[PDB]
Amino acid sequence: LDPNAIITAGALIGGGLIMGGGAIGAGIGDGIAGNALISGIARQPEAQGRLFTPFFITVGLVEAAYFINLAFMALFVFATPGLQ
Amino acid sequence: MEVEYVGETLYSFEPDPETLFDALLPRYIATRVYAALLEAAASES
Question: Quick one: signal sequence residues (chain B)?
Fold first, then answer.
């Protein structure tokens, strides 16, 4: 077997794991933050704007992490380290 | 006491509406008795 074939198979599996973890984290975190925001809206019609500030921060702390994974996925799949 | 209904941010109740209602109704009756006593005293004077 060509060693690069093994490298690429392992890289694809690693990238798949990275994406799976990132998507699970992003979905769960965004759902939880949105649940908080929706409950806050329901309690207070007029609290909407003041709640979007912290909410976005939460999203920023989640999506950012998710997108970080994306970068490394590419590094795994396209510029695979250890390729030879 | 009877109940009267009127057509017309929701309040937050701590711990829950039922316990507060139970703990407040006797207090309301005490308030009404006190008001009755005050009116009686004024009428007596």
Answer: none
Method: cryo-EM
Sort out which chain B residues have CB atoms less than 8 A from A48's CB and list them.
Answer: none
- Fill in the amino acid letter for A53: T
Q: How many Cα atoms are found within 13 Å in the side-chain-facing hemisphere of B28?
A: 7
Cα A18 to Cα B4: distance, rounded to the nearest angstrom: 62
Of B9, B12, B13, B14, which to mutate for an interface test with A (greatest number of A Cβ within 10 Å)?
B9
Reported resolution, Å: 2.5
Parse chain A into domains and list their residue ranges: 3-78
> Could you tell me the sign of the dihedral formed by the alpha carbons of A1, A3, A75, A19, in that order?
positive
CB contact under 8 A, A44 and B12: no
Q: What CATH number was assigned to the domain covering residues A3-78? A: 1.20.20.10
